[PDB]
Amino acid sequence: SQQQIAALSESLQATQQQLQALQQQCYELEKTNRLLVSEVMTLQKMVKAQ
Amino acid sequence: SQQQIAALSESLQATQQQLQALQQQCYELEKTNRLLVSEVMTLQKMVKAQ
Amino acid sequence: SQQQIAALSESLQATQQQLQALQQQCYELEKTNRLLVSEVMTLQKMVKAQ
Amino acid sequence: SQQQIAALSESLQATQQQLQALQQQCYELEKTNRLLVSEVMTLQKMVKAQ
């Protein structure tokens, strides 16, 4: 049983650690993208105002 | 069987690799969009001077 | 034990939920950025008319 | 053994199906983002040219 179930458990833990790093990276993308949207929409208002 | 457990563990390693590729995609998109924010800030400056 | 295997299976269900949340984040970002393309095309039209 | 190993296998298959849908969704984001970058950089050239 436990040879393979312990290595499988370890594999799942590693997968979960990778998932957390993916979550964190894509969160940074979302945060940057918010800024991009704001600055593009400001640029739109600026061009409209002239 | 132990063979079945081993197959599952190996399965999870490929999953980890695919998570890593997604993490790299979020990384690249974040850097691209952060640079684009800078371009848009330069665009705002250009428009204001005109 | 069977308990150990069950714990791993339940573990994978939470993983699926976290993958779904990432999928939703990519979905939202794609829609936002596709709309932003449209805004930028309108910006190009504004600038060309000026 | 196989009660729990079969449900764990099924759980992993479901997780993999979700991973594929995540990959596909984030690919669409990347494709849209390419267009956004191009159109912002065109807008930059247009503003520079006037």
From Swiss-Prot, chains A, B, C, D:
Compartment(s) where it occurs, according to its Swiss-Prot or TrEMBL record: Nucleus
Which residue stretches, if any, does this entry annotate as coiled coil?
Answer: 1-39
Segments of this protein annotated with the region Hydrophobic repeat HR-A/B:
1-50
Q: What is known of its domains?
A: Homotrimerization occurs through formation of a three-stranded coiled-coil structure generated by intermolecular interactions between HR-A/B regions allowing DNA-binding activity.
Q: Which family does the similarity line name?
A: Belongs to the SKN7 family.
The record's subunit annotation is: Homotrimer.
Function as written in the Swiss-Prot or TrEMBL entry: Transcription factor that is part of a SLN1-YPD1-SKN7 two-component regulatory system, which controls gene expression in response to changes in the osmolarity of the extracellular environment. Under low osmotic conditions, phosphorylated and activated by the phosphorelay intermediate protein YPD1. Also activated in response to oxidative stress, independent on the two-component regulatory system. Regulates heat shock genes in response to oxidative stress and genes involved in cell wall integrity in response to osmotic changes.
Q: What is this protein called?
A: Transcription factor SKN7
Which gene does this sequence derive from?
SKN7
Q: Show which stretch of the intact protein is covered.
A: 160 to 209 of 765
